[PDB]
Design a protein around this nucleic acid. Structure first.
Ligand SMILES: Nc1ncnc2c1ncn2[C@@H]1O[C@H](COP(=O)(O)OP(=O)(O)O)[C@@H](O)[C@H]1O
Length: 157
DNA sequence: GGAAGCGAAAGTGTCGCAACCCGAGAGAGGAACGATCTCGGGTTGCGACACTTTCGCAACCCTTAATACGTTC
RNA sequence: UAGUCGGGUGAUUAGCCAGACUCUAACUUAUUGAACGUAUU
């Protein structure tokens, strides 16, 4: 499948079980690498599942999620591919996540020397809308700290 | 292909809390014996969370290269 | 309208001017090796 998302707004529609949540899940998995490498140097983002993400009746027994990002005319293409081979397969498939690491390294290093505005990556799945009680006192982490805005930002809730 | 670090992802054990049960006990009433509510352990079920295992990113570039100037793989 | 092509000007990778295009739709890449162009030769 191939998608040509718009710059400002993209709306995916269809029946139930057509793969819209799959597309959003793949995009969030791709963006987790940007978030992880913004937070840490060489940080590891989320990866495709080897139990449920590979097509059940695929012959190859691996799955790919390729993406291309645009960051202006000076950086027109940032290709990142997330791959996973099925469970119990001798040949494993690697992920090409180097360009995302490079872009996030640029962001983080430039931010360290002089504060710059950082991009916001957020996923709001169906996993939200759970009840909300004010049960969060010792929640460990410091909410004023600037880089707390990336904590659990692609979890869904 | 894959050091060395490290973290994601998934599975499994564990451990504390709630909920209930069950015997002991002081003693309500009203004229005695012991109702009824509570104290102290004890058991079980359950679910959040800690702990455990596996995978994967990607150093280096091996003895072993050539060195007019430019694109391309 | 975007986006793209690029003839001119421009101490010139920028800015501007004229013109043109539009399959749902470029993202310019790699040496010393191979071939191509060029120079010595
Ligand atoms: N590994 C798989 N192999 C084959 N089909 C799958 C696999 N994983 C999910 N599906 C199918 O893809 C659909 C997933 O639904 P989803 O992406 O949430 O769609 P929606 O947004 O329309 O509700 C289901 O119809 C499910 O049967």
């Amino acid at each position: 499948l191939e998608i040509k998302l718009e710059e400002d707004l993209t709306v995916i529609i269809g029946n139930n079980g057509k793969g819209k949540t799959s597309i959003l899940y793949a995009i969030a998995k791709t963006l987790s690498w940007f978030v992880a490498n913004i937070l840490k140097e060489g940080g590891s983002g989320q990866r495709l599942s080897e139990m449920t993400d590979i097509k059940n009746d695929a012959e190859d027994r691996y799955s790919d999620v390729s993406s291309t990002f645009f960051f202006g005319k000076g950086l027109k293409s940032v290709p990142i591919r997330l791959s996973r081979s099925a469970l119990g397969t001798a040949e494993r498939r690697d992920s090409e996540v180097k360009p995302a690491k490079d872009l996030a390294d640029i962001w983080r290093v430039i931010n360290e020397v002089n504060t710059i505005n950082l991009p916001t990556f957020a996923l709001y799945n169906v996993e939200r809308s759970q009840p909300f009680n004010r049960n969060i006192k010792d929640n460990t982490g410091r909410r004023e700290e600037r880089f707390d805005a990336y904590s659990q930002t692609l979890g869904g809730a």
